[PDB]
PDB file of N, CA and C in Angstrom:
ATOM      1  N   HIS T   1      -8.647  -6.732  17.813  1.00 29.19           N
ATOM      2  CA  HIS T   1      -7.780  -6.608  16.736  1.00 29.19           C
ATOM      3  C   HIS T   1      -6.712  -7.465  17.378  1.00 29.19           C
ATOM      4  N   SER T   2      -6.644  -8.689  18.064  1.00 26.51           N
ATOM      5  CA  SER T   2      -6.035  -9.411  18.625  1.00 26.51           C
ATOM      6  C   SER T   2      -4.749 -10.125  17.650  1.00 26.51           C
ATOM      7  N   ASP T   3      -5.486 -10.785  16.627  1.00 24.61           N
ATOM      8  CA  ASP T   3      -5.238 -11.200  15.509  1.00 24.61           C
ATOM      9  C   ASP T   3      -6.013 -11.087  14.223  1.00 24.61           C
ATOM     10  N   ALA T   4      -4.886 -11.573  13.090  1.00 24.08           N
ATOM     11  CA  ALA T   4      -5.573 -10.865  11.520  1.00 24.08           C
ATOM     12  C   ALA T   4      -5.553  -9.851  11.371  1.00 24.08           C
ATOM     13  N   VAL T   5      -4.697  -8.684  12.417  1.00 26.88           N
ATOM     14  CA  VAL T   5      -4.113  -7.419  12.284  1.00 26.88           C
ATOM     15  C   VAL T   5      -3.701  -6.768  11.194  1.00 26.88           C
ATOM     16  N   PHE T   6      -3.146  -7.892  10.294  1.00 25.73           N
ATOM     17  CA  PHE T   6      -2.475  -7.527   9.060  1.00 25.73           C
ATOM     18  C   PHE T   6      -3.476  -6.793   8.157  1.00 25.73           C
ATOM     19  N   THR T   7      -4.664  -6.920   8.601  1.00 26.56           N
ATOM     20  CA  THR T   7      -5.961  -6.955   7.571  1.00 26.56           C
ATOM     21  C   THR T   7      -5.708  -5.398   7.159  1.00 26.56           C
ATOM     22  N   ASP T   8      -5.326  -4.579   8.188  1.00 29.18           N
ATOM     23  CA  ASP T   8      -5.270  -3.383   7.996  1.00 29.18           C
ATOM     24  C   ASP T   8      -4.190  -2.674   7.472  1.00 29.18           C
ATOM     25  N   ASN T   9      -3.327  -3.336   7.693  1.00 28.53           N
ATOM     26  CA  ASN T   9      -2.033  -2.893   7.098  1.00 28.53           C
ATOM     27  C   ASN T   9      -2.220  -3.559   5.520  1.00 28.53           C
ATOM     28  N   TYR T  10      -2.429  -4.525   5.322  1.00 22.45           N
ATOM     29  CA  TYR T  10      -3.016  -4.679   3.648  1.00 22.45           C
ATOM     30  C   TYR T  10      -3.675  -4.261   2.844  1.00 22.45           C
ATOM     31  N   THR T  11      -4.702  -3.745   3.956  1.00 24.43           N
ATOM     32  CA  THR T  11      -5.959  -3.287   3.222  1.00 24.43           C
ATOM     33  C   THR T  11      -4.880  -1.533   2.764  1.00 24.43           C
ATOM     34  N   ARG T  12      -4.661  -1.022   4.069  1.00 24.70           N
ATOM     35  CA  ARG T  12      -4.327   0.155   3.864  1.00 24.70           C
ATOM     36  C   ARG T  12      -2.865   0.447   2.683  1.00 24.70           C
ATOM     37  N   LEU T  13      -2.120  -0.397   2.834  1.00 20.44           N
ATOM     38  CA  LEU T  13      -0.872  -0.384   2.050  1.00 20.44           C
ATOM     39  C   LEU T  13      -1.306  -0.399   0.465  1.00 20.44           C
ATOM     40  N   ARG T  14      -2.577  -1.232   0.534  1.00 22.47           N
ATOM     41  CA  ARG T  14      -3.043  -1.528  -1.369  1.00 22.47           C
ATOM     42  C   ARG T  14      -3.222  -0.400  -1.502  1.00 22.47           C
ATOM     43  N   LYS T  15      -3.406   0.603  -0.967  1.00 22.77           N
ATOM     44  CA  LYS T  15      -3.844   2.046  -1.428  1.00 22.77           C
ATOM     45  C   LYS T  15      -2.421   2.531  -1.848  1.00 22.77           C
ATOM     46  N   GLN T  16      -1.309   2.334  -1.184  1.00 22.28           N
ATOM     47  CA  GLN T  16      -0.078   2.868  -1.549  1.00 22.28           C
ATOM     48  C   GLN T  16       0.063   2.491  -2.736  1.00 22.28           C
ATOM     49  N   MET T  17      -0.132   1.270  -3.435  1.00 20.51           N
ATOM     50  CA  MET T  17       0.643   0.622  -4.566  1.00 20.51           C
ATOM     51  C   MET T  17       0.074   1.282  -5.312  1.00 20.51           C
ATOM     52  N   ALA T  18      -0.896   2.159  -5.301  1.00 19.17           N
ATOM     53  CA  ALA T  18      -1.438   2.889  -6.571  1.00 19.17           C
ATOM     54  C   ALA T  18      -0.714   4.011  -6.641  1.00 19.17           C
ATOM     55  N   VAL T  19       0.207   4.804  -5.906  1.00 16.85           N
ATOM     56  CA  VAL T  19       0.611   6.123  -5.870  1.00 16.85           C
ATOM     57  C   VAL T  19       1.728   5.820  -6.196  1.00 16.85           C
ATOM     58  N   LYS T  20       2.500   4.608  -5.361  1.00 17.10           N
ATOM     59  CA  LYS T  20       3.865   3.774  -5.964  1.00 17.10           C
ATOM     60  C   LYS T  20       4.088   3.625  -7.189  1.00 17.10           C
ATOM     61  N   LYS T  21       2.916   3.345  -7.840  1.00 15.69           N
ATOM     62  CA  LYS T  21       3.014   2.987  -9.064  1.00 15.69           C
ATOM     63  C   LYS T  21       3.278   3.872 -10.538  1.00 15.69           C
ATOM     64  N   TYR T  22       2.312   4.771 -10.259  1.00 17.35           N
ATOM     65  CA  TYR T  22       2.689   6.136 -10.946  1.00 17.35           C
ATOM     66  C   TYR T  22       3.939   7.021 -10.849  1.00 17.35           C
ATOM     67  N   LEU T  23       3.981   7.256  -9.192  1.00 16.58           N
ATOM     68  CA  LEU T  23       5.309   7.787  -8.779  1.00 16.58           C
ATOM     69  C   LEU T  23       6.366   7.377  -9.140  1.00 16.58           C
ATOM     70  N   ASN T  24       6.624   5.874  -9.072  1.00 14.87           N
ATOM     71  CA  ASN T  24       7.859   4.897  -9.863  1.00 14.87           C
ATOM     72  C   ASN T  24       7.819   5.650 -10.926  1.00 14.87           C
ATOM     73  N   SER T  25       6.981   5.731 -11.787  1.00 16.78           N
ATOM     74  CA  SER T  25       7.159   6.210 -13.495  1.00 16.78           C
ATOM     75  C   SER T  25       7.427   7.198 -13.491  1.00 16.78           C
ATOM     76  N   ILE T  26       7.211   8.533 -12.877  1.00 12.42           N
ATOM     77  CA  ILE T  26       7.537   9.506 -12.823  1.00 12.42           C
ATOM     78  C   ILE T  26       8.844  10.093 -11.964  1.00 12.42           C
ATOM     79  N   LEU T  27       8.430   9.678 -10.834  1.00 15.03           N
ATOM     80  CA  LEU T  27       9.577   9.729  -9.387  1.00 15.03           C
ATOM     81  C   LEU T  27      11.026   9.158  -9.672  1.00 15.03           C
ATOM     82  N   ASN T  28      10.574   8.135 -10.183  1.00 14.66           N
ATOM     83  CA  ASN T  28      11.807   7.191 -10.256  1.00 14.66           C
ATOM     84  C   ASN T  28      11.742   6.233 -11.665  1.00 14.66           C
ATOM     85  N   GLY T  29      11.120   6.991 -12.821  1.00 10.55           N
ATOM     86  CA  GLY T  29      11.116   7.083 -14.046  1.00 10.55           C
ATOM     87  C   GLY T  29      12.204   6.578 -14.600  1.00 10.55           C
TER      88      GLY T  29
END
């Protein structure tokens, strides 16, 4: 995991986008 480690953050972060999307409409509506 020396290089291209961003893959983990990008792949995992992509999941957050799902919640942030809805939470943003309700939590930040």
